[PDB]
Design a protein around this ligand. Sequence first.
Ligand SMILES: [K+]
Length: 270
Amino acid sequence: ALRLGFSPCPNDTFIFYALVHGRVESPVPLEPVLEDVETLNRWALEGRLPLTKLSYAAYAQVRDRYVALRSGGALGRGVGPLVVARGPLQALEGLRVAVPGRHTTAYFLLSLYAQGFVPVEVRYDRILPMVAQGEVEAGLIIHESRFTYPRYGLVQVVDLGAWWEERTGLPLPLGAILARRDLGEGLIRALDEAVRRSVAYALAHPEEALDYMRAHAQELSDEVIWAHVHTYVNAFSLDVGEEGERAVARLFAEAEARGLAAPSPRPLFV
Ligand SMILES: [K+]
């Protein structure tokens, strides 16, 4: 079996459900390792896992070690991380912003959007309470927080996905599934096909994945679980496509323009 890292969020458990339960064929058996996305991001800098979900911004840091599968990721126009606050803010200048991980695509986007804030790095589930309790002035939120933030009395400062679309005319690449290059070209292609099959299986039999999604997101109501997969799993999860490729190229061009990532001649996808 090969270790496969992903988050316990409904979109990842939905996407990998079939593969992990033998409902679709896989070229090799897989051992899921569920972790926070920033833990996976840090691990990839060390090339720890042979297969792993990773923030697209972090992928730009590990291209010589990993290649992205065309399937299994999260990209789109309405999946952007949001910045929220207790009330409207004129700007983020000089304000403390709780963020879910410096290597996330969310953090990268927030850094494109504004540069005078003070980041406070924490697990994503601490952000809404920290903002509501006044420990920071704004929060960069991901995962299911986009559905629940009003429960904390908060308002949206900016939808970074919408901001990215307005700036580039492209969908936002959020997360990718990466294969470590030492696995060999053939196996990597077979894994890409297996992940695509897994996504297709859950799309066809969504209810079959519910017990698994609930097991790993025990704090979430079914209403939130269903909203979460509806929001984060879309056509780009089956295949990045021509537009998805252009969007990833644009994201990496912006990172390179700021010296956040080194250019590479290696193709971005399997
Ligand atoms: K809601």
